[PDB]
């Protein structure tokens, strides 16, 4: 989409691996705000919004928290307390044509600045102080939007760049998009420290002979002693007995 017409989307309710990205491309522009890129794949978020668009080469710097410019102050603005991050990778093999790709535009003239995540599409002819040259030309009737017009003879500063902006939320988050997990391969017949989806304990694991009902996840003897657990991977029932101890 264009800079001023990004295609908003939400990405929630999923076990999100933020490291599947790294196998895609060289990731020319990859810096994360509010969250470290290294510690991204694990952290959890409320709602992850995605804005996709294309800009020129020397204007990718204006997409930053609190940064003023001509694409940031006129047609796309992200907060200063922004949590998420922006990812821009030069793409002039699918976006720059010979003669000028007049498909990506950018608000060059406007009235004031825009609020964070404020997208506008209006393509009216800008005023001229007085009544403008509505549908005509003249002294100063300058359209607010201007096309980039990418071509394969432009320098890297004038080449199209695809860019995705991810907006996270960390305040009150109903963890819905995050967590890669790590099911440490199972060990049996040795008293081992176990953590089954939060249930932590120690003991010897043995093949079970009791029929857990399909909606049950735990087993208990008298006095709430956790006696058994079902595998979250293979759904097999296992018996827990505390490893041997005694007096000498």
């Amino acid at each position: 989409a264009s800079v001023y017409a990004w295609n908003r989307k939400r990405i929630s309710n999923c076990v999100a691996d933020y490291s599947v990205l790294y196998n895609f491309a060289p990731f020319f522009a990859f810096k994360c705000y509010g969250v470290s890129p290294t510690k991204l794949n694990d952290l959890c978020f409320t709602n992850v919004y995605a804005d996709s668009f294309v800009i020129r080469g020397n204007e990718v710097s204006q997409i930053a928290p609190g940064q003023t410019g001509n694409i940031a102050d006129y047609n796309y603005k992200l907060p200063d307390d922004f949590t998420g991050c922006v990812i821009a990778w030069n793409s002039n093999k699918l976006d720059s044509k010979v003669g000028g790709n007049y498909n990506y535009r950018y608000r060059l003239f406007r009235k004031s600045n825009l609020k964070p995540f404020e997208r506008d599409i209006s393509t009216e002819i800008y005023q001229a102080g007085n009544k403008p040259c509505n549908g005509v030309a003249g002294v100063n009737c300058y359209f607010p939007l201007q096309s980039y017009g990418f071509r394969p003879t432009y320098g890297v500063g004038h080449q199209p760049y695809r860019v995705v902006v991810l907006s996270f939320e960390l305040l009150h988050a109903p963890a819905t998009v995050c967590g890669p997990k790590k099911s440490t391969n199972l060990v049996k017949n040795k008293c081992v420290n176990f953590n089954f989806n939060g249930l932590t304990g120690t003991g010897v694991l043995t093949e079970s002979n009791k029929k857990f009902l399909p909606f049950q996840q735990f087993g208990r003897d008298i006095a709430d002693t956790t006696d058994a657990v079902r595998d979250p991977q293979t759904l097999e029932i296992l018996d827990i007995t505390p490893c041997s101890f005694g007096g000498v």
Partner: antibody, heavy 118, light 109 residues
């Protein structure tokens, strides 16, 4: 007629301050990319500063940190404050409304001489 | 900061003929240019913007051409009052940017 008229030109002792002013007519400045240009006697021209229509301004490197552009939008006029005038900054300053890719700089100002004691 | 170099410095042509002035860039300036005629004594005047588009009013007698790293301005028939200075201003980076030349002095007889 459409014009840019300037004021503030004169003489001041080094290290002193100054203020250049730019008046317009039949055209607004607040919402117009404004650009002050200057010319040293006998030399070329150089882009000095620019203010946008949202307020985010910019300045050249040679004068960064010493000059400050402003405009009384209420009465449709432009200004450029200068300080710490050194031997180089002696030049004639022009006011311009630059558009860029959609029509290059056109409308200019009568200019204003800025010299130093010596 | 792309440095532009004009050439030649001076030109003296009999009245009524053509004149050809080159201004040379050091990088890709594609079609982002303009030509100003600053008659001696006041502010410059825009003649030809973009690549070769003739500014309003500006007599057709002027003609601009070129693209990339090399550009040229051409005048059909110099009249006695055409003597002035000309500068090619590039703007490949518009917010904030422009780059002027050293100017060229053209006269007649």
């Amino acid at each position: 007629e459409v014009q840019l008229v300037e004021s503030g030109g004169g003489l001041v002792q080094p290290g002193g301050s100054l203020r250049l002013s730019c008046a317009a007519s039949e055209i607004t400045v607040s919402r117009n990319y404004m650009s002050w240009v200057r010319q040293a006697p006998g030399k070329g021209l150089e882009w000095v500063s620019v203010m946008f229509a949202g307020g985010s301004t910019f300045y050249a490197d040679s004068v960064k940190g010493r000059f400050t552009i402003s405009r009384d939008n209420s009465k449709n006029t432009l200004y450029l404050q200068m300080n710490s005038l050194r031997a180089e900054d002696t030049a004639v300053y022009y006011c311009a409304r630059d558009l860029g890719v959609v029509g290059a700089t056109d409308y200019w100002g009568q200019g204003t001489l800025v010299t130093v004691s010596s | 900061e792309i440095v532009m170099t004009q050439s030649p410095a001076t030109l003296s042509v009999s009245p009524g003929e053509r004149a050809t002035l080159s201004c040379r860039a050091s990088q890709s300036v594609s079609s982002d240019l303009a030509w100003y005629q600053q008659k001696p004594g006041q502010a410059p005047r825009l003649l030809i913007y973009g690549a070769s588009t003739r500014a309003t009013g500006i007599p057709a007698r002027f003609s601009g051409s070129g693209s990339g790293t090399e550009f040229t301005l051409t005048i059909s028939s110099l009249q006695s009052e055409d003597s002035a200075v000309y500068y090619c201003q590039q703007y490949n980076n518009w917010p904030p940017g422009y780059t002027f030349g050293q100017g060229t002095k053209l006269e007649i007889k």
